[PDB]
Amino acid sequence: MFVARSIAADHKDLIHDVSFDFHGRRMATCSSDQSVKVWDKSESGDWHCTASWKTHSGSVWRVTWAHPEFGQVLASCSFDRTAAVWEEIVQSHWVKRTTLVDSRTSVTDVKFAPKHMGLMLATCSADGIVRIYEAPDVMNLSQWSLQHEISCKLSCSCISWNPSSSRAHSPMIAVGSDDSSPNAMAKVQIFEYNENTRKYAKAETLMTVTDPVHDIAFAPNLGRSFHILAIATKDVRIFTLKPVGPTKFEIHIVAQFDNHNSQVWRVSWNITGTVLASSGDDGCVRLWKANYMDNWKCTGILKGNGS
């Protein structure tokens, strides 16, 4: 249910990902050529780049954006086992704040936290530990306190958490896996931070997923009574948790779609948590809208180029 038009953008090497701003103005790209870009749309609708530089002696594949309530901030994951937290200075000088090199193995993911706990970065690294960074004093951005870590005992693949800012929800972390050895067990485990214990303890385990998951994306709360997960292991398995010391949540798998039949690339929920803009390995990446009977049926298809 769309008309596809190709944007007028030119990145040097092969692109990796696109993040997006809050109000819907400025993205951030990557390449296997150690380059990033930010394109502010003109009032006429045209896109023009405004900055670029060299990132690291490897490839940067997980650039990300921040919230305007802290100014302007970016971050990225690369070969250097560090997060490039670069802010804007105003022709603008995009250099400030130090690196976060604290990982012995390769970093897997990099994402920010909801805007109701301040700045809280988190990074999960390859063969093990997941790691969260915080800084109370946001007047200078070069300080960063770890204070919390985990031990997933597997090759983490993707991270996510729910923007639900309700006072009645404990913050939770969802982790992906990548092990594909000739055995089956777990690939997505859910965490939950406490207050008195101050520990992210383990609560649940989706014991029906065994394929090499590639991305995890919660659905924004917006006011529902339950959360929504999203996996890309073998078939866009949209899960659904419901609370009923751990919070024993009843699981109800409401999605199994074979359309990709692939190693599906990425999954990304929308602003209001209704349309699941999915993607995959083979070809055109579809949508999965909603129906009157709470039915998840594909409602659009658009091809990787001029379609």
């Binding site: 249910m1 596809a4 038009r5 692109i15 696109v18 009645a168």
Partner: protein, 744 residues
């Protein structure tokens, strides 16, 4: 095994090397080469049996000069070409001769010289192995000749050096210079069965053996820098990608899966990414990259079946607040634009939905689309308001009918009807006013409803209601009056006239069956009412194809107290669990009403109406609940995302005028640095006309006396707006702050 080649200077021609040499031609669409393209074969050659290698003479003209090696060691120059316009006609047919006879394995033309051809021959006791011919003038005169007592197996010209040749011997891996043949650099490896030099780097060479692939460079040339995995089956072909940097295409015997390898970080670890693709479901003989097209492939099965493909993946998605996602595919990004709930709330907000201080029912029309849930809630909310004003002129209505009819006394069951309201106790008229049967006032006649319905065009709703008030000569009159327009109701007027009320009268048996064949469901409750066997009110009350408002009135007029409470309580429980907006008529704006609207939000994610509805005169017992205040915050945060800032402000004006308990606070304060009630000092003056802070003298914003929060340098609100239009520095000398441009 058969191999496939492309035309170096043609984008639409390829040849298949097999038992016979065949040239094809790609044609468009709208032999099925592709799902959107097909093949158009042009020429056949079969003169040379026992072909062992095929190579292409890469020049701009002739168009199809092909070099073919045989099992006797003689390279034969053959052409398929086109309508001959011979420019070098002497060249065709010039088969070469080696001075003995052996197998010919590998062939390669010189990319730069364009006229030196290299041939590799198997081993012989006392003769040359690699022979460098020069096809410029049956010429058995090699221009060079190397490798006494050895057997070559792979050949490849180096790109940078003009005359350098890389060769793979039996256990020698030598790089030969063609200026002095006394010397050569070499290693002793096992991965010799194929040699490739990548185009871009042109310093890394890849070679393979059995099932293992090795990677070298020409700057160290000592040991294999990188290696791969011991795949349990032999390899057949390896080739780099000539348009995308970093791809080791790979094939194995008797399979159908190609493996493409990603190498970006060309001492720690190697960056290796592997993804396998199956272009087709049949076994694969060999493949062929493309020189010009973007990341292309064609494959040929052991049968004659051809095919095609392409090579790109790992797209990423980014969403936008206006519901329009972003593509990302290599050198291309695409955006798609536009019912989704998020899209609707944009137009509803832009139309000032839910902001009327007038006839309230004007909100369902303001919503644009027609939906029964919305076109009923605003009718329900309007009625509760008109009662509150009327009663004030002379609030418990907001509880809902379930609490109103709990104390329903009286309830004397009516006897057999007398076909021809004020005798009901006030609690029942409370339900009748909300439903709309009567108007605000003691009017016992339901005429105002009846006469408003006819002018609205609805005829049946003027019949069902009328004879529900026991009027069977007005019953025909409603159908008689409407029968002049539009037309079967006139015949129904006869049927709807008579009824015998006997025990086995022909009307009763006929009508109970003759009801179910009609479409409109009011006529169903019509017949299902007349035949109701003195209390069998189980058909009319449960035909949920009819509006709940009528069912609330009709159940209230007839059913007794013991029967009413069980029915009204059982309807709300279904109404609440299934999440129906119509339940507000029953549940009201109490704690239960908040519970029901949880289900409505849970299934449609509508926070606009759930926000406005609960703000409607609810008390300080459900408006302070955590649930309701969460919906308000999310809607406000959503509006800030759409950049509809002025619309958010108008919403907070409405919220301020209705809930004073959420008032904002002051953010400004005057703190004199000296103590000015104590220090007797004035605030600073502007930097342009220098008048002090406060002295007097539409356009009234001009003397607003703004400030700066970084440089502590202020002035008159309009004076610097005129000054800042041509400069970008603080007016005050010895200050380097750009006040306006610092925001952006």
């Amino acid at each position: 095994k058969p191999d496939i080649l492309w035309a170096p200077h043609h984008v639409d021609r390829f040849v298949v090397c097999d038992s016979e040499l065949s040239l094809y031609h790609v044609e468009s669409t709208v032999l099925r080469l592709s799902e959107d393209s097909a093949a158009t074969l042009l020429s056949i050659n079969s003169d040379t049996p026992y072909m062992k290698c095929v190579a292409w003479y890469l020049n701009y003209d002739p168009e199809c000069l092909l070099a073919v090696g045989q099992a006797n060691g003689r390279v034969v120059l053959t052409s398929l070409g086109q309508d001959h316009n011979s420019k070098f006609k002497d060249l065709i047919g010039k088969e070469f001769v080696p001075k003995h006879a052996r197998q010919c394995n590998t062939l390669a033309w010189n990319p730069l010289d364009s006229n030196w051809l290299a041939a590799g021959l198997d081993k012989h006791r006392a003769d040359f192995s690699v022979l460098i011919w020069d096809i410029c003038s049956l010429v058995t005169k090699p221009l060079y000749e190397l490798g006494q007592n050895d057997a070559c197996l792979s050949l490849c010209w180096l790109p940078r050096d003009q005359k350098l040749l890389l060769a793979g011997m039996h256990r020698n891996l030598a790089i030969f210079d063609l200026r002095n043949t006394s010397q050569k650099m070499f290693v002793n490896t096992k991965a010799v069965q194929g040699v490739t030099v990548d185009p871009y780097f042109h310093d890394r060479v890849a070679s393979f053996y059995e099932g293992q692939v090795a990677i070298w460079d020409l700057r160290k040339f000592e040991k294999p820098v990188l290696t791969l995995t011991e795949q349990p089956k032999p390899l057949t072909k390896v080739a780099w990608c000539p348009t995308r940097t970093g791809l080791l295409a790979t094939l194995t015997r008797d399979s159908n899966i190609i493996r493409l390898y990603d190498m970006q970080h060309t001492e720690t670890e190697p960056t290796i990414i592997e993804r396998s693709v199956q272009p087709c479901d049949n076994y694969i003989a060999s493949f062929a990259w493309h020189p010009t097209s973007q990341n292309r492939m064609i494959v040929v099965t052991p049968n004659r079946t051809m095919s095609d493909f392409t090579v790109f993946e790992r797209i990423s998605l980014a969403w936008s607040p206006i519901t329009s996602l972003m593509w990302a595919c290599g050198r291309h990004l695409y955006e798609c634009t536009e019912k989704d709930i998020a899209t609707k709330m944009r137009l509803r907000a832009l139309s000032r939905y839910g902001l009327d201080t007038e006839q309230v029912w004007r909100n369902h029309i303001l919503a644009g689309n027609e939906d029964p849930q919305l076109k009923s809630l605003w009718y329900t909310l309007h009625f509760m308001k008109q009662y509150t004003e009327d009663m004030d002129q002379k609030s418990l209505v907001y509880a809902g009918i379930k609490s109103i009819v709990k104390s329903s006394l009286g309830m004397v069951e009516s006897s057999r009807h007398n076909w021809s309201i004020q005798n009901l106790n006030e609690e029942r008229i409370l339900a009748l006013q909300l439903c709309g049967w009567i108007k605000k006032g003691t009017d016992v006649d339901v005429g105002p409803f009846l006469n408003s319905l006819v002018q609205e065009g609805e005829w049946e709703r003027a019949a069902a209601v009328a004879l529900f008030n026991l009027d069977i000569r007005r019953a025909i009159q409603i159908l008689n009056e409407g029968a002049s327009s539009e037309l079967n109701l006139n015949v129904v007027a006869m049927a709807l006239s008579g009824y015998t009320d006997e025990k086995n009268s022909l009307w009763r048996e006929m009508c109970s069956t003759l009801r179910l064949q009609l479409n409109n469901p009011y006529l169903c409750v019509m017949f299902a009412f007349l035949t109701s066997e003195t209390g069998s009110y189980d058909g009319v009350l449960y035909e949920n194809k009819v509006a709940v408002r009528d069912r609330v009135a009709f159940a209230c007029k007839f059913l007794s107290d013991t029967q009413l409470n069980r029915y009204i309580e059982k309807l709300t429980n279904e109404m609440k669990e299934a999440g129906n907006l119509e339940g507000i008529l029953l549940t009201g704006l109490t704690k239960d009403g908040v519970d029901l609207m949880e289900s409505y939000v849970d299934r449609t994610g509508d926070v606009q109406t759930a926000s406005y509805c609960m703000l409607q005169g609810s008390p300080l017992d459900v408006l302070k609940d955590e649930r309701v205040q969460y919906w308000i915050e999310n809607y406000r945060n959503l509006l800030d995302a759409w950049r509809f800032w002025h619309k958010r402000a108008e919403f907070d004006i409405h919220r301020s005028k209705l809930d004073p308990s959420s008032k904002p606070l002051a953010q400004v304060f005057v703190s004199c640095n000296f103590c000015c009630p104590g220090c007797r000092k004035p605030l600073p003056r502007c930097a342009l006309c220098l008048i002090n802070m406060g002295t007097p003298v539409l356009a009234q914003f001009n003397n607003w006396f703004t400030w700066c929060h970084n440089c502590r340098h202020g002035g008159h609100a309009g004076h610097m707006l005129s000054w800042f239009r041509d400069h970008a520095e603080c007016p005050v000398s010895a200050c380097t702050c750009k006040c306006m441009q610092l925001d952006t």
